[model samples]
Target: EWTREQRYRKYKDWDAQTLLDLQAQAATSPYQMHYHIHPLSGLLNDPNGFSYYNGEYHLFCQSYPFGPVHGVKSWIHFASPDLVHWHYLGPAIDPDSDLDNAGAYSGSAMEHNGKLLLMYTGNHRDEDWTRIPYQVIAEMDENNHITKPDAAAILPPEHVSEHFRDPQLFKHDGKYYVLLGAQDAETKSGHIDIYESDDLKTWHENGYLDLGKDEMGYMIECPNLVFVNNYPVLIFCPQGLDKAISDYQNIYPNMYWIGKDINLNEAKFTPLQSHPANLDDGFDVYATQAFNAPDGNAYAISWVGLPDCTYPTDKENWANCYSQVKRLEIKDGALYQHPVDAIKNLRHNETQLNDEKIISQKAGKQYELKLYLAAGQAGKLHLASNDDLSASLVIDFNTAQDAKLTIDRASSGPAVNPDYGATRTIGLNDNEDLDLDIFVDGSLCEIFINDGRHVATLRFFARSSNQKIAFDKDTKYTGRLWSMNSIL
Candidate 1:
């Protein structure tokens, strides 16, 4: 464990040779990802500053480059011409200046007048442990160099706690507005702070967004608002959400709500759905950022790591990763999320899996499997199965009341954060068939059931020997499979 002094150590304090050695040491991990965005060294979390600018998609992440622990946070930059093949562009914002001496936390991005705008929170703490937060802004031009004015757009108001961070900027009715995740200092209730701007340089505070509901969780972080089919969709991570609201089995939960419209002036939102729902049903998902692009499409990506949780990769000097970019849509009043079309660029050497072949198959470490089964067919599917079948990820389906599907990783390998749980279940409504589109990339498994209607973002540490894919004979599955190529 790192002490407070080590966690807040400055980046300049570390020698260049020591940092290079850490990266070289981390590359030897056996559980490295093939297509996901993983840390080269140290720790990474929270997808930040996601936007499209200058003919590419620019994304940033919360990174601590000293070790696996969260130490001296910075924003690691990445750019993608098509969202599938990403290129590392180095750090966009470092915790070097006095304004952000402690950490560079989560936030959003926007493009204005040929410049990319990076809006984020800066954390600084005093020796007495008093915390202060600043809403900071940085700009990037055609050369990709970042420059800031050494100031904050707003501060932690006396009425609000230090939890005020992760701003979401949007243009509403020809005016720019920013929504910040905040908590009331008096009541300690979680909510959002509203700010408006006309030229993106200056801003003024507005009231909270009225959802006609009580408080949300203890602290809301990473609040992202995007539009799909011209409708509002709010995605955020709520700290300490009520267990009664949903099955929040993880340390924290990321949730979303689909709304009809939003009034930034009134700070009121009319939700198409009454309450917010969990964004992903599986373990290891947090701090998702979604954006609406110039082409009238909405897209999102999430950090495939959880807070206050240790991973198998921590021992190897690196930790954390990012889920694949997902395209969002409005389907039947529900948010429909699917991988981008450019994902097909990573597919090659296809195979048709018939009943006989799908029954007991040998798959490689990385591939894409599209499966289908009738609703009445009850059976089990084993993925990443070892030679003796003693260790594997089990997907079980039962036709008994409501047709439920369960994912059990008890035997997937040594549990990564076992206290969270080894199982997750979701009920398939009576109207739906079992259509599973799974992407197996080394230790990570991403499942999209019912054509992106339900999603499970999971991580496991299965060994190289676990390469068999099998299904019970009673349930017939007919689909296609493809060997996935590395996009790293």
Candidate 2:
């Protein structure tokens, strides 16, 4: 392994020609995402510095460009006006100084005093490979250029462990507050700590946010707090959670808890009686960051990948992508996520199927399909290649069984990892009708059920291009199909 100094120097001294060459190579890869924001090459994970600033949405991700695996990390920037078409803005932060010589991890962004402020974790290590996490702050100009050359680091509170990182900064009622995902040095378990600052530079430790002993895991990676329709939502990723109570099959589950009012002064959060819910029911989502946009809506984007796992594309020199931007809202005391309104602009060549008993159609790699089933109808929808029915994914909805939905991808394609299971089932209210909105982009598929009450994001690779969609003959449903345009 290379020393810390060597890694820092290598990242800083990387020439423009090397990046251009990698981009050229990555452009030839067929698995590259068409609509989602992804790294041109190497690994991309944990969206950082997500905010709407200076009349545009700026997003950054933890990027490792040396190879497909995680190596020396940096912050890669991208910008968008409508959140549908994104423009790449090259590297934003690197491991150039002592405070962040090891890596620039995850964090959030805010606009302060007419300048964009960035608060992120600067990861470092001693000779013994021990961790030293620093919360660093910087200022950026309207052109997305770093204006503060001498960015400073904030000293962490005494009670936090080296695992403390991912500071989520926000302003509320003229006071700046930050929530850091932390592990207690004494308990060795996960908790979120609150800090308040009169100015963005100086901070005072408040205390731990109230969460039950079973609500947290060994470590919380990313924590975000947002308010929707006056309801507070706490989003977090808990590592080493007991899968028995949580019903989370992933190594680490990203979850959210809807709670009563949060009294920051008391550092207490009163949760509702409903248990915490998983953000995504599928196998590949984590480290989601959300922000209230200027459009008066809370939006979110998640890393379309997982930790401690390998993908089939890893051998080809690229790993992951980001999910499409989602509009978040609280409805009937539950969180609902749907694609933003801007996505409708991509719809074209629409076909309407009203009261169709049996339907079959050929589909492209990029398309959108919406299905509306009559109340109390039970059926299945299958998506597969025209030549091979055995290699397909089946979506079964059973109203008799409490309106549960099951997605079976056992024969969808070649397995990338065994940890990603062959089947996933989600429960729904018995009285609720089924309305499914499906988006297909290359190897990725996202299903929004019942207006985003539950979502399943999956990655499936097909051996042929003859993709087809079919529904059960006895099921009564009306649907529409639209070929979606590429935004890349």
Candidate 3:
């Protein structure tokens, strides 16, 4: 269990030697990620402070440098000349002062005055353990040193409780605004509000966004606003949405509303359709942050693991990772996500197949596979299965339910928090034939099905000796595989 002192450990207290010990132990675990962004020695969550600034891409995430559990979080930094290769820049925001003594919680990054500025939540607790949230901002100077101000720019109103955090910054009609995730103090349901600001200092309540639904879950977290093709898309995570509300099977679920437009003056979002849709059907996907880039593109990066859950990597002292940077687009009133084209730079040693059936091949721990099933035929792709097929991770798309896809990792490794079922499924187009884009890096598998129309970001661990890849005998295929280079 996490003790009180361990929960509030300061970053500097862990000296260079202790950090080196932890990092060295974590490096030997065999489950290290290849291309994903992960913590060096502890738990990582909530991709924060994502921006393209000064001709380079800067990203940060919630980092707790002590161990695997959520303790004394900070914002770890990374810079990338291009999305394919990221350079570690170390911690950017730590919880050491009075303003953020509790933790430097999740936030967003934006560029202003030729410098990268970050605005995030300062989690604080009083003597009686009453929680207070501060809308904090950090400024970066010329020499790349970060400075935190003495006081918060804004504080939560009495209407919402301490759950008010994750201030997502956006612009409309030459003005500034923040889309805030909150909780209903009286009803205890998910809520969203807007705050308006002129010069990024003075702030006031604009209004609450009318989602037009009364059945929002208990709490909302990590609300992101992205403009794609000049239209607004709102993505948020509701804490307690279960199978009762559609097919959400995880402990918490993410929802997206593709809107034609949004009016800050009226506090209303005009949805293209009457309902919202699921952002992803993966066992591990949450806290997705998205922003429009300077090069006329929209992108998002997500935390690939859920909150309050245990994983196999926890024993190894590292817990979570970030999803591949996804290129975002709005299609027919729905959100579609695909890995950015920059990821292809890591591909080499291509393995091509042309109209074959019953094939078996050997692959490394990190590889990318593109598969196309024959005309009107269903198929299955197995990864890391032993000779007897007793332990394998299966991606099944049988000839039933209109080729609905399912990912089963029950026997892929040691059981991984089986409380939330062992399998995940999502509906695809009605066809006997299917196309698949799969990425495997060590224990994690990110599958983008039918060219990102549907995605399942699942994690599995198989024996390193089980490198045989095979397909079912009932279908022919034309595909290619490439060995991937690690970006860690």
TM-scores, one per candidate: 0.97, 0.94, 0.96
Which residue runs does candidate 1 get wrong by more than 4 Å? 357-361, 399-401
Candidate 2: pairs in clash: none
The residue ranges of model 2 lying beyond 4 angstroms of the native Cα positions read 1-9, 12-18, 148-152, 355-361, 384-386
Candidate 3 local lDDT, 80-131, one digit each (tens): 8776688888889988777678989998887788777788998887787778
Which tens-of-lDDT digit does each residue in 1-488 have in candidate 2?
Answer: 33445444565476878767777655555666787787877789999889999999999999988556667788999999988889999889887777777888899998988888888888877678778888888778888897434544566667878989999989986799988989998888888888888887678888888887574887888999988777788888989777765787666889988898787767888887357789998778899999887778888899988887877777666778888998888887788998988899889989898775434456777788898887676777777555445667678887654688898777777785666577889887785678899887777788999989988987777654647787664777789988888877
lDDT of each: 0.84, 0.80, 0.81
Task: Give me the candidate number with maximum lDDT.
Answer: 1
TM-score winner: 1
Error of 1 at 470 (Å): 0.5
lDDT of 2: 0.80
Taking all chains together, the TM-score of candidate 3 against the true structure is: 0.96
What C-alpha lDDT, on a 0 to 100 scale, does residue 100 get in candidate 2?
77
User: What is the TM-score (0 to 1) of candidate 2?
Assistant: 0.94
